[PDB]
Design a protein around this nucleic acid. Structure first.
Ligand SMILES: [Mg+2]
Ligand SMILES: [Mg+2]
Ligand SMILES: [Zn+2]
Ligand SMILES: [Zn+2]
Lengths: 589, 589
DNA sequence: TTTTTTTTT
């Protein structure tokens, strides 16, 4: 038996990273400066430094975590006495446990160990307080004594009151003292297994987890997470008998991850190539032949524009795309790829969606009997991409409910005496089919779309796809068979790198409008408005929302190349793609 | 007087199997490799070796079973001393009990003996944990003692706390320690009697079964199982008085089997026949005369293609068949046969089904008032075949809800704040009648089918059946009367053998496309588009989906012969069969 | 009652 306090402190102060910069030393300095009261330690670093220490942490986690926390607290206090009186104690969290078990394969033998489960967050409860050291008061004409009922022991999960007053050795009734009671933050969350690991013909399972102290509010619903901790059984009503000798299992979260310096370096060198825009476009849906304009348009929606917020109003900075085409034109394949490449995307269908399920659901809690809101599909997709397949197959009554969300990016709910406004800053991608299944050349655009002009004006770009057999049939057949044969096209950025590239660009890039683009946009907008009045029978209208599109598209083009200003070249690209949108629908230039 | 501990040991190690290889020794050796912890014993094997032990097992199971487990553990321990500290005990499961009782014939005299029940699983609860050895601490300021209350006795299904502390002989308050508590896996399932056993008029009855230890998650809902164990009465609140001395019956499962190496050699022998494809086609619906092209198409759907999973998207590998015919053409006859020979099939009707029930339904459980997902018809058919009879009779607004599942093989639900995706990789076979009941040659094909072009393109093959009274009436009449007279057709593979053949092919066979097949497929696909453009009047469209139909059919043809490569011969059959399909819908090539 | 999805007069 050898003390690990010296080894743990030595590991923190002597570990060398990639550049031998003592990374953990900097984290401690950040912890001291910010009073973060929590430290994250990578498991492989501990294993590389000393494999014997790693095994004790994995196995004897129950009794070794407080030892390391106490030793670390002394080191922090030695480094800076001012850290005291602000943080009572620190927490050590281990990340990178080699023991990973699927949510569906949890057995009795795994209870009481430190295991890691990766899943999807579903529900998060509001933060609440849990008592871990109570202070009762035996009220009785002779007692007038207060005491901490749990002696040299933490208050268990089941609340219990003293039976005999220790100060007097007599029975009676006891009163809790909130002022001297010690509390700890407590949150309840529910995790779900990934759809790619669910067995065939079975519904996904769910597991409930506990977040405490600083771990609260570490994630939002719909985010892939990785958690590590100790499993335990759950007790709800143990006071009254009636068998129920079967208990569930809940997880005590110790370390939580969501979804680096080296990644930024990899991303930065990509933008050095002048042809970065073409590479990104060619990397969208590599298994789909042709549709270069559609592929180019989808890339703009992934990056999006720059939202503008003023002292009196705000302007949306998202691009909405509507695609209409004949069946079999691979409209859904691109949408599925978007949902798999975007950092945050939600995939829905017209028939499988409802008005309540798309914006906000008002439900009544049976335990409380009061109404409370539930996040809709658009709300969960805030700051991301919203995909609505088969937009024409949903009822118009439910479809018209998203008019405010598509433009104002807000959802107003006035039901059951509850009034609220929720942010819905998401870009909507919709696909559908013409009124008669296939597009009819002889019939005009009005009866083919079969959609009200109001919703059409909210779409920045509208593309019409036509399945016309011709000279491209032979090359299309070869491409499809190559995909089925396993052959793939190289010189394509992988999905993981592309997803990282999109996330980085949306966070650290904000292009500015220059004078050259201002003149180019104005001339095109005025000229295209003049042609609109020539043929006012088209279902589409050239509204001021169209002028908004050029600014957003130009910003998206600049954001693609990690630029800082909208140059003259970007304005030309925005005009070129805008012309194709007008040309496809039936408006000549 | 006589001990069976040594009797069981020699039976395991000295028992000549069918091939005289000591199969039970191999099973024990296989058990050690992966720590199976469960050994399956055939009742016939015990009866063949020593009849005396057979009666003891079947009549005194509750006593002799633990004794045999101890003997087996020592034998395994000697073979592998390392078997300790991972598997503390093993289990002995007995199958093939001759005592089989119908679910409706259970009486009081059937309680307490080992019986076998055949039925259909309908509900599986999530895996939970049951306490069988608790650990309590007496909360009395003088005690501080830890003890296991269920001493010298397994903890009953009704949880009970001690009234007097064993180590101090005093009453008071007791607390349970989860860390020192011993748990065991516990799962609840519901079984239903087969439709062939339900008597006239009444609805089928249900029985509750309990699965423990490794038996959890041994089967999925909708499967046919054969459970074996001891019946017992169910109690919830025995303390709660107020009459009601009537108790239900719950089933304690000890061994469950769902639905041998001799099958593989028998299956391999069948595939060696060069005319295996013809024999399989002739073995589909032996009671139906004619319809050779329809029989061949149905065989392809049973086997199906090879799904492709890529890093970005996935390609559907199932084949969908649509049949349109006049009444009396026995369309529903093969559909019933398909649902009987397929390893996993679900039979539905257009009128008796709704959109919610087809894919997924969101229902509110009154126990908690919270919405939860319910598996639909397509979800439960994942990995199998879904049959939709009388598709034309059902509502159009309900038919559009399955467009996504038939191509993307996924179901998306956004209702009441619930967003999820479910896999629905199931082949769809549909039948229906024309617009005016009978087919009319004077009217064009477009208005006769009366279906939207979108759903028509999804189907791989569409066959139109016409009832023309000709010279074949006498031949058809004789065949029908022969069936009614008890005469049957010989030299046909039985359903039991055919079902085994199909299951083996779909698992261990994965054909690949060759260069020769690519040229034939590409040339014929181009011919479709050229012919289709020449006649823009047919309601069917030659979309790129038809190209995948050639690939899927070619793979299915190769899979029927247990081949690994799709040769030119398979490609020619794929081209030939679709030529008939095009001819049926009035397209001549 | 009121809001939600569902099958049903
Ligand atoms: Mg689609
Ligand atoms: Mg019929
Ligand atoms: Zn007192
Ligand atoms: Zn005691």
């Amino acid at each position: 038996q050898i003390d690990y306090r010296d080894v743990f402190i030595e590991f923190l102060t002597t570990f060398k990273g990639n550049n031998n910069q003592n990374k953990y030393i900097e984290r401690i300095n950040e912890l001291v400066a910010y009073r973060k009261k929590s430290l994250i330690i990578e498991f492989s670093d501990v294993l590389s430094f000393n494999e014997n220490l790693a095994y004790e942490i994995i196995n004897n986690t129950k009794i070794i975590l407080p030892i390391l926390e106490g030793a670390l607290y002394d080191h922090i206090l030695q480094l800076d006495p001012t850290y005291q009186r602000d943080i009572e104690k620190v927490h050590v969290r281990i990340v990178g446990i080699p023991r990973v078990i699927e949510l569906r394969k949890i057995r009795s033998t795994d209870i009481g160990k430190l295991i890691t489960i990766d899943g999807i967050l579903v529900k998060v409860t509001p933060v609440k307080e849990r008592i871990y050291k109570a202070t009762y008061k035996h009220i009785h004409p002779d007692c007038m004594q207060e005491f901490e009922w749990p002696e040299d022991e933490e208050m268990p999960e089941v609340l219990e009151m003293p039976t005999i007053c220790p100060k007097c050795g007599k029975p009676g009734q006891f009163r809790l003292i909130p002022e001297k009671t010690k509390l700890i933050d407590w949150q309840k969350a529910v995790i779900q297994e990934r759809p790619e690991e669910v067995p065939s013909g079975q519904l996904p399972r769910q597991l409930e987890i506990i977040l405490e102290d600083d771990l609260v509010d570490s994630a939002r619903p719909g985010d892939r997470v990785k958690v590590t901790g100790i499993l335990d059984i759950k007790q709800d009503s143990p006071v009254k008998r009636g068998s129920r000798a079967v208990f569930d299992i809940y997880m005590k979260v110790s370390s939580i991850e969501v979804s680096s310096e080296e990644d930024e370096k990899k991303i930065k060198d990509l933008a050095k190539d002048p042809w970065i825009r073409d590479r990104i476009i060619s990397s969208i849906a590599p298994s789909i032949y042709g549709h270069w304009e559609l592929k180019e348009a989808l890339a703009l929606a992934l990056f999006g524009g720059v939202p503008k917020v003023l002292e009196d109003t705000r302007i949306r900075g998202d691009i909405h795309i509507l695609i209409i085409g004949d069946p079999g034109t691979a409209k859904s394949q691109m949408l599925q790829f978007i949902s798999r490449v975007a950092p945050r995307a939600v995939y829905t269908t017209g028939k499988g969606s409802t008005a309540a399920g798309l914006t906000a659901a008002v439900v009544r809690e049976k335990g409380t009997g009061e109404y409370y809101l539930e996040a809709g599909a658009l709300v969960l997709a805030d700051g991301g991409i919203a995909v609505i397949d088969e937009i024409d197959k949903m009822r118009d009554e439910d479809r018209v409910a998203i008019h405010e969300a598509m433009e104002q990016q807000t959802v107003s709910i006035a039901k059951a005496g509850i009034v609220a406004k929720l942010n819905a800053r998401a870009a909507v991608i919709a696909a559908g089919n013409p009124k008669f299944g296939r597009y009819i050349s002889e019939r005009p655009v009005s009866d083919n779309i079969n959609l009200p002009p109001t919703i059409l004006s909210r779409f920045d770009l509208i593309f019409i796809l036509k399945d016309q057999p011709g000279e491209q049939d032979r090359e299309l057949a070869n491409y499809i068979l190559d995909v089925h044969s396993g052959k793939s096209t190289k010189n394509i950025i992988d999905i993981d790198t592309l997803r990282k590239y999109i996330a980085y660009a949306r966070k650290y890039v904000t292009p500015k409008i220059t004078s050259e683009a201002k003149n180019l946009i104005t001339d095109f907008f005025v000229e295209m408005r003049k042609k609109s009045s020539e043929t006012p029978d088209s279902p589409i209208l050239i509204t001021p929302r169209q002028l908004e599109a050029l600014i957003r598209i130009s910003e998206a083009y600049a954001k693609m190349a990690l630029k800082a200003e909208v140059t003259r070249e970007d304005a030309e690209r925005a005009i070129n793609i805008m012309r194709l949108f007008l040309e496809s629908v039936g408006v000549d230039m």
